[PDB]
């Protein structure tokens, strides 16, 4: 009986309890703050704040060279990597049979299972007349038809961390079991050894849980495309149209999609969404195309289009005040903490040299206008052509310091280039009187004065804007000369654009080559080693308020995440704190023994 | 051994931490507490030497 | 600066001290070090200090600790005496990591004491005025308790 307002009234006390924890989190012994790291008077938190304390321990010397630590710094609870726990990745979409329509049948709302053969939910999906007979066309096969397949892209992080670009088809009568066997092949979730578990969840979605302890950077996004006839009547025609042509329905699925890209105006390589007219038995027909977003929402892409499902990284940084960040974090190959400036490209890439490695950038600048750039770090090369005359171009190879002298100017080695230079690059997208360059890599040698002048403009640029690698690893930027940022960013890779090997079939096509990730329309999850109060509590409050067991994309919060997700997040947190709880007494009883024998 | 000297007791409870470690190795603190008891043990060998 | 290090002090031994430029906690794309033996002179020390003693070598320059450095003059012949300054920009924090070099603190280059024996040995008065200058912190503003502990 909890009306919405009822759920807030319940939530209010939790909100009080939330601050109760914040108060507790801010606790001190008369200024000896329990959370300060090593420095007593550090008041560590607020309702909306970060950890405010050192990370050394409060320590006292009693030794021939001995300290004595007796606390825990606040972060080590507040944002601590409780590395035992694993990713909970789920589809925001939910699935059902669709011969019935569930607006016809909202009370019914039956979810897919192994029995749910693929024909059934495409049943009405084939058509606009939406009148197909559930049994006699599909199951009471006295009058059943021929049927074509469906298409799917997939992108995700293999639990080890490797990248892959893949495409695959779905056959007309497929079931859950067909999906699972290919899933085992696709992820290496082998029968001999699994790496993640697959489930259909409490709310009707499809969920996967990771077996890898402390895996923070498991992510997923997928898109499926399908053709659509108009009429139940039209479909039977394609049997005869196709089969007397000598082909089942399945060939027809192939024709429309390729033609769309053949002139991308007919549906681009990635934005494939055009309805098309085609020939079967060289009878003329027109057909509609389906779009499927396994992260679907109230989305308009970075381009400003009503975002087409291919819009994964076609989303900007996520906005919070003067701060914007790519929620798709950059995370350590290990503890899964986050990046540092001097990290060369060598530490990052998958390859001996940055072969064919190249990147693209999108920037809606602080000056309003958008400035988008492409970079081949394989040659340490950055670029920009002139709008009026792109023939003229701006040349810059990446640069560095000397060993002992101002004897300067031979270009960086490709693999060596580091993260700090990235944040430096954002410094260039700063303001108003912005810079430009031109250089020749004379045996790599160049004029440092050009670099030095660039450096000086950068050292003045210090004040403009911030780049940060946050406590979630999210690729973060803050508008310093603002409390609300007039800036937006989006990035992508260009070994993408090159795809798995065609012709694409029901057997998965899988290729490698894209080497980095960016801000994108990522999977949904709240649980992982590292904690964060605001995301964990406030996101889960929203779901209770809306009553959404987990989520709703159309809900103002398109990433409403909680309620059912809270269960194991509680499983995580009970352990997370208990570890911290038992830790302190170990000091206390340890110190007792030392003091006691010292006393004696 | 007024108070059976720390080393021999460090070992003792350390070995108590062992049977605790058998209780739950997934409870990492069993390691840490176990490790600590030896830490007193070893450093106590070290100080006696000095 | 002519005088060699050991000749000016017989505690000087083969040692090194590193310099990582810091916010109250620090960084590693900007870091200098100075090297010592039982023979070298301050002039050499100043050369490692006051030069393009790089810390991010790949055959170019700039983008180092040197960003934080500065120097100045202030003297008057009306006195016949004056002040000469060697500094890094305050607003940055600093740390200095020594291994067996033993010179600067002894000669109170930033040391605690002035005077050499109980006739003149004394606390530096700035410390007498403000014990807050006794920040327990090696690393930052007061971002460390250690020094309080270390002197135990």
Residue numbers in the entry:
A (entry chain F): 101 to 700
B (entry chain O): 103 to 152
C (entry chain V): 356 to 507
What does the literature reporting this entry say, word for word?
The flagellum is the most prominent extracellular structure in bacteria, with a molecular weight in the hundreds of megadaltons. Structurally, the flagellum can be divided into three major components: basal body, hook and filament. A ring-like structure formed by the proteins FlgK and FlgL, termed the hook–filament junction (HFJ), forms the connection between the flexible hook and the rigid filament. To assemble a filament, flagellin monomers are secreted through the flagellar basal body and hook, and polymerize at the distal end.
Specifically, we exploited a C. jejuni ∆flhG minicell strain with additional deletions of the flagellin genes flaA and flaB34. In these minicells, flagella consist of only the basal body, the hook, the HFJ and the FliD cap. Particles were then subjected to several rounds of two dimensional (2D) classification. This allowed us to produce a map of the FliD cap of C. jejuni assembled on the HFJ to an overall resolution of 6.5 Å with 15,077 particles, and the atomic model of the cap–HFJ complex was built. In this structure, the cap complex also consists of a FliD pentamer with an overall width of ~130 Å and a length of ~180 Å—dimensions that are comparable to the cap structure bound to the filament. Like our previous observations, the HFJ of C. jejuni shows a two-layer structure, with the proximal layer comprising 11 FlgK subunits and the distal layer comprising 11 FlgL subunits. Notably, the C. jejuni FliD orthologue includes an additional domain, D4, not present in S. enterica. Most FliD monomers adopt an angle of 89–95° between the D0–D1 and D2–D3 axes, which is larger compared with the angles of 81–84° measured from the filament-bound FliD. When the two cap complex structures are superimposed, it can be seen that their structures are highly similar. However, the D2–D3 plane of the C. jejuni cap is flat compared with the tilted plane of the S. enterica cap (Fig. 6h(i–iii)) while the D0 and D1 helices are well aligned (Fig. 6h(iv)). In contrast to the filament-bound cap structure, one of the FliD monomers (FliD 3) is positioned downwards, and its D2–D3 domains are flipped, probably corresponding to a major conformational change from initiation to elongation. Interestingly, there is a gap between FliD 3 and FliD 4 in the cap bound to the HFJ, corresponding to the position of FliC incorporation in the structure of the cap bound to the filament.
